[PDB]
Design a protein around this ligand. Sequence first.
Ligand SMILES: O=c1ccn([C@@H]2O[C@H](COP(=O)(O)NP(=O)(O)OP(=O)(O)O)[C@@H](O)[C@H]2O)c(=O)[nH]1
Ligand SMILES: [Cl-]
Ligand SMILES: [Cl-]
Ligand SMILES: [Mg+2]
Ligand SMILES: [Mg+2]
Ligand code: NA
Length: 327
Amino acid sequence: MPAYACQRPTPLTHHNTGLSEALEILAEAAGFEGSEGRLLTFCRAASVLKALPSPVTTLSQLQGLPHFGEHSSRVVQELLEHGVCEEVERVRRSERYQTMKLFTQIFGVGVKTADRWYREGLRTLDDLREQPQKLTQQQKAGLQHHQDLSTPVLRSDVDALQQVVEEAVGQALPGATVTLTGGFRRGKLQGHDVDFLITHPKEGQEAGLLPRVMCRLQDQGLILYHQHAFERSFCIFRLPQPGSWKAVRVDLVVAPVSQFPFALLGHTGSKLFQRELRRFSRKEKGLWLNSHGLFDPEQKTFFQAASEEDIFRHLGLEYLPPEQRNA
DNA sequence: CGGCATACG
DNA sequence: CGTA
DNA sequence: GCCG
Ligand SMILES: O=c1ccn([C@@H]2O[C@H](COP(=O)(O)NP(=O)(O)OP(=O)(O)O)[C@@H](O)[C@H]2O)c(=O)[nH]1
Ligand SMILES: [Cl-]
Ligand SMILES: [Cl-]
Ligand SMILES: [Mg+2]
Ligand SMILES: [Mg+2]
Ligand code: NA
């Protein structure tokens, strides 16, 4: 079992679901408290279990697994012996965890904002609605749409949204393409949003594209919220439903075709997979990876990539299709 | 002990 | 600060 | 919290 998540296949569904979910609760709580390092260890330990080929049934099967020390091993031990981990249950029912979870789930609210509100005494969504002067326009949108945004987006919804995005993109710039990225590209059957990556096969033709796309979607009445030159937009879209509609989060990203493999990789995830890949690149290979490129700081050169396959080869990693990046 | 991904709006 |  |  290699130590970095990008060094091993991680399927979407696996054999240690309950154990990984418990560790991810502790990871989430660590983030709510600002402990990025402990969040990372708990996330990595959880991910290790996702990569295993069968269920963990005895503590000894953790020996030698990366990222399992005393704490994560005790969590697993208690789940195996008693079906529950007291530390995990205590977090789950704590007022602090439940409210930070509720607040950070709002579009436009991060840990630092939720925490300040928590310390001011706020606990519910209606508490926030009662004092709307203290909310950004983005948080106002997130709060208004919060119920719909809390509803999973279905793979069945994605096809309809991709077609209306393609229509607006095709008018904005003939020949531009729309690629589904994010969790659905990894095979997820449901998601918190839909993520698209837009490019054009003629380098440079994509310059200025996203405002043109956003203006056309807005003219069609499809945009309930967006932030407005730019290359990423975090939208709320009107998605038809029988007799009505629902609000859905949609992320649009534009990249030049030269950078498309890097942006596809970077936006296909998982989040942990990308963090680990970047960490692996920098710490093991001495190369700096982002959604634009891969930089050799000694040669002062960028790697040209024509595919995700190229990027894995550049880094000396076995290729992993998106469905095996569910770290 | 230092490190923990990386960038855009 | 928020977002991916 | 864990790794190197
Ligand atoms: O902090 C982040 C968030 C997101 N991302 C990258 O952006 C992609 C989409 O970000 P996302 O927030 O849409 N997450 P996703 O994996 O689609 O699952 P879901 O919750 O169902 O939407 C992720 O899969 C990562 O590739 C990061 O690299 N870092
Ligand atoms: Cl990036
Ligand atoms: Cl990007
Ligand atoms: Mg997504
Ligand atoms: Mg997204
Ligand atoms: Na949020």
